[PDB]
């Protein structure tokens with residue numbers, strides 16, 4: 001299974017620039033590449049990636065997406081003087097030409113294809129291409145919006161042709177619509193295109209009616225084009241995560257792509273003079289992380305726009321940090337998306353409801369200068385994952401995992417804890433696991449050397465109480481508990497420091513807003529239901545809660561449809577800088593193996609196709625959203641009714 005992250009870059013792509021006055025294009029400068037690579041070098045990220053060389057796209061590769069007549073016209077620009085280049089540039093909208101731009105365009109395109117090949121041949125897990133010129137606005141026969149050839153459209157058509165892929169997701173988080181990509185795949189159900197973009201009711205570039213939410217694709221491609229227009233500026237972390245949890249991710253995991261390509265424009269970040277949005281560079285760590293379980297981690301990130309050199313460098317580093325598997329930064333201050341974003345989100349979900357299972361319940365009444373703080377460092381843990389199997393069980397562990405070694409001070413604390421709170425306890429198994437829990441938690445919370453952990457335990461009540469209480473005094477200001485099992489746990493949810501998610505078999509009405517209890521009907525549809533609950537309820541609440549530790553718990557009677565556990569374990573590491581402790585009750589080799597693999601950052605196997613969720617499950621989940629969304633605004637995917 002593949003490892004490592006490709007970084008594709010060449011300073012030749014910085015060797016073209018604007019040669020005449022033009023306020024429209026003067027923001028697109030060679031230094032965008034210079035600053036981005038140097039930022040990667042400064043933070044040690046470039047040195048940890050596999051450098052893959054650029055190459056030129058061939059004529060045949062360019063003709064996959066562009067016409068012979070347009071290619072022939074651009075092929076003449078190396079021979080043009082400045083007067084001729086200015087006249088050629090005026091034939092198109094918001095683009096300039098240069099004697100070297102055709103050369104660099106072929107390099108930008110070939111760099112993208114090198115990235116696709118490295119990933120699809122399993123030479124790396126994922127990667128990023130830092131290229132100029134950008135691509136997503138160029139069209140079959142036109143340059144547009146600083147773009148000459150459509151790098152990301154190349155990549156999907158090339159991956160289709162040479163690897164016989166049937167399902168490719170393109171995520172365009174640039175602040176501009178990628179109209180070239182939309183047109184290219186408009187009728188194609190094999191390529192799902194998602195774009196959010198500043199729109200402001202069509203008054204923002206490129207000013208197209210077809211960039212609105214109503215453009216869902218055409219013909220057999222209906223439903224495979226998703227536009228989320230931002231109709232106000234100033235969108236925040238909360239708006240972007242609301243878009244992912246309530247539009248993009250439900251569709252992406254149902255689509256089940258075989259490759260993910262990201263049109264990564266960081267002009268959607270705070271400080272950008274084109275986007276004027278307010279999302280922090282740290283959000284891109286999470287946008288990257290939330291997509292990484294798709295396609296077994298095969299993600300090709302391709303630079304598009306991004307014009308504030310400071311914002312650009314930091315967002316590029318946050319993206320590569322996540323590609324490398326470094327712990328995600330904690331996002332504070334999350335809450336409801338703004339009303340304009342909620343309107344865009346509800347409109348997209350409604351028009352897309354004829355095409356996607358996660359939205360289908362919506363179709364029937366019965367159913368329903370700027371400055372910001374510098375980002376903190378993101379150190380990978382010395383040993384990412386510590387494992388404590390039952391005594392004697394020897395397992396083959398991934399390279400960045402390690403077995404537990406109870407210390408002297410730790411042993412004294414178990415004695416103190418036993419005397420005070422479990423007088424009768426003398427079971428020397430239980431007492432060993434308590435020493436393992438405290439030992440693992442101490443390494444997780446008081447060291448950057450261990451990130452997360454898994455401990456197999458015997459008695460849930462004592463181990464849960466010790467794990468929770470010990471974390472709450474480290475101190476962990478807030479703890480998210482995720483419990484797969486029935487019954488009640490020694491978990492008090494009164495003081496706001498604990499949020500409890502419970503996946504259980506018995507229908508039980510929960511009474512307050514710090515618990516989410518999910519009672520999913522048994523059957524062949526448990527998987528789709530849980531995925532729908534995870535993306536649409538669990539993750540929105542968990543992100544807003546912003547825990548300092550995640551405590552996972554699985555009762556023994558519930559280890560037999562839990563094919564979702566690896567996705568949850570991977571996605572929930574977006575919280576608490578990845579600090580997750582999982583307690584598995586009883587030995588199951590496969591569950592322990594899956595848990596350790598996901599905790600350690602390994603690729604997650606795809607879920608493939610799934611029987612769409614039970615309508616009773618969707619009803620249960622929407623009643624949870626209604627009950628919780630006034631407290632946890634990140635759950636909202638409609639505009640609230642005003643009094």
Ligand SMILES: CC(O)(O)NCCCCN
Nearest residue numbers: 094134145176205304305
């Ligand atoms: C690559 C892009 O999407 O950032 N293009 C920006 C075009 C700006 C036109 N004023």
Ligand SMILES: [K+]
Nearest residue numbers: 172174176196
């Ligand atoms: K976009």
Ligand SMILES: [K+]
Nearest residue numbers: 185188191224
């Ligand atoms: K499509």
Ligand code: NA
Nearest residue numbers: 089090092094
């Ligand atoms: Na012009």
Ligand SMILES: [Zn+2]
Nearest residue numbers: 174175176305
């Ligand atoms: Zn852009």
